[PDB]
Amino acid sequence: HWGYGKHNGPEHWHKDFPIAKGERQSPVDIDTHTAKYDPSLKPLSVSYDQATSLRILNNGHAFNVEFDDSQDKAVLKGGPLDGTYRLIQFHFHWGSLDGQGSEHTVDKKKYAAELHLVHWNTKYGDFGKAVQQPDGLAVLGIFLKVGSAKPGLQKVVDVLDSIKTKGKSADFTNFDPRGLLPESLDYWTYPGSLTTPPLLECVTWIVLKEPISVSSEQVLKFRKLNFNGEGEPEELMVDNWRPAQPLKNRQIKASFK
């Protein structure tokens, strides 16, 4: 099965998922001098006051914090988006070392990690229908750098011991994803893909310019997770990031001057 090892990592994915070599793959390098300010882009509307978190799951590739998306409780609107996108889950990608881990890069700079808040377009009715559409998903990407602790992350860090291995889940109610946001909602945006198989070309990417700070102790706890199942030889969950893909015939737009 696909993963992030020497034998099943990103350079292998094209054999089972040929869209890996497609025209709108993610992530990409954001060249900050080549991105054009688009004064027609609206401020992002992040409406997370009624978010209902349910569960946290180790899926063998990352961990997902899942939300109740059976109503408009936590939605993303505005910016480059038409209509209403409902939050379904968030997850991270991170490195074995602080100098790598992000999927997007900024002038080839890699951050220690990247948060992905995944949303689906309510005009398609469910997430599985939305991933078949070129405007099906909106993913809000937020870089993490190592410095001061992020207080709003600690409730996630403290549950990771209970989902160490693939297939483990834990109740995770009353988590407020507003505690993961930076101060500024300035962003870059471009049309792209899922960054894991099946690599579907269904994503409007919205990547925030301002990183959040997390502590070395917080990211060390991410790196204690396991790719393996319980009672299998330990393989640490690190370096679960896809490198930057060719931009091809795409333009990255900036919300800011």
Ligand X SMILES: COc1cc([Te]C[C@@H](O)C[Se]c2ccc(S(N)(=O)=O)cc2)cc(OC)c1OC
Rounded Cα distance, 133 and 74, in Å: 21
Nearer to Zn ion, 160 or 230 (CB): 160
Clarify whether 61 is annotated catalytic. Answer: yes
- Give 75 or 225: the residue with its C-beta nearer to ligand 0I6: 75
Taking the C-alpha atoms of residue 207 and residue 189, their distance in angstroms, rounded to an integer, is 6
Show the site string, 138-157: x = touches ligand 0I6 by CB under 6 A, - = not.
Answer: --------------x-----
The CB density around residue 26, as the number of other CB atoms within 10 Å, is 22
Q: How far apart are CA 241 and CA 254, in angstroms?
A: 24
Q: Which phi and psi (to 5°) does residue 180 adopt?
A: -100, -5
- Residues 161 to 190 in contact with ligand 0I6, rule: CB under 6 A: 176, 178-179
**Considering the complex, what minimum distance in angstroms separates the CB of residue 75 from ligand 0I6?**
15
Positive or negative: CA dihedral 90, 94, 99, 104: negative
Cβ closest to ligand X, residue 19 vs residue 149: 19
Is 24 or 116 the residue whose CB approaches Zn ion more closely?
116
CB of 234 to ligand X, least distance (A): 24
49, 104, 156, 167, 240 from 221: Cα distances, Å: 28, 22, 10, 18, 15
195 in a known ligand binding site: yes
- As measured in angstroms, the least distance from the Cβ of 128 to ligand X is 2
Q: Which does residue 152 bind out of ligand X, ligand 0I6, Zn ion, none, counting CB within 5 to 8 angstroms by kind?
A: ligand 0I6
179 binds, among Zn ion, ligand X, ligand 0I6, none (CB under 5 to 8 A by kind): ligand 0I6
Residue whose entry in the numeric block shows the structure tokens 């409902």: 86
What is the 8-class DSSP label of residue 162?
G
Give whichever of 116 and 221 is closer to Zn ion, judged by the CB atom.
116
**Contacting positions for Zn ion (CB under 5 A):** 116
Residue 162's CB: how many other CB atoms inside 10 A?
13
119 is in an annotated binding site: no
Q: How far is the CB of 167 from ligand X (least distance, A)?
A: 15
Question: Out of 1, 61, 104, 119, which one is annotated catalytic?
Answer: 61
**Rg of the chain over all Cα atoms, to the nearest angstrom:** 17
Q: How far is CA 77 from CA 44, 53, 64, in A?
A: 6, 19, 22
| CB of 176 vs ligand 0I6, minimal distance in Å | 4
| Residues forming the site for ligand X (CB under 6 A) | 116, 118, 127-128, 131-132, 139, 194-196, 198
The answer to whether 92 and 156 are in contact (CB under 8 A) is no
Percent helix / strand / coil, the chain, rounded to 5: 15, 30, 55
Binding site members for Zn(2+):
91, 93, 116
Catalytic residues: 61
Binding site members for substrate:
195-196
Residues that bind ligand 0I6 (CB under 6 A): 152, 176, 178-179
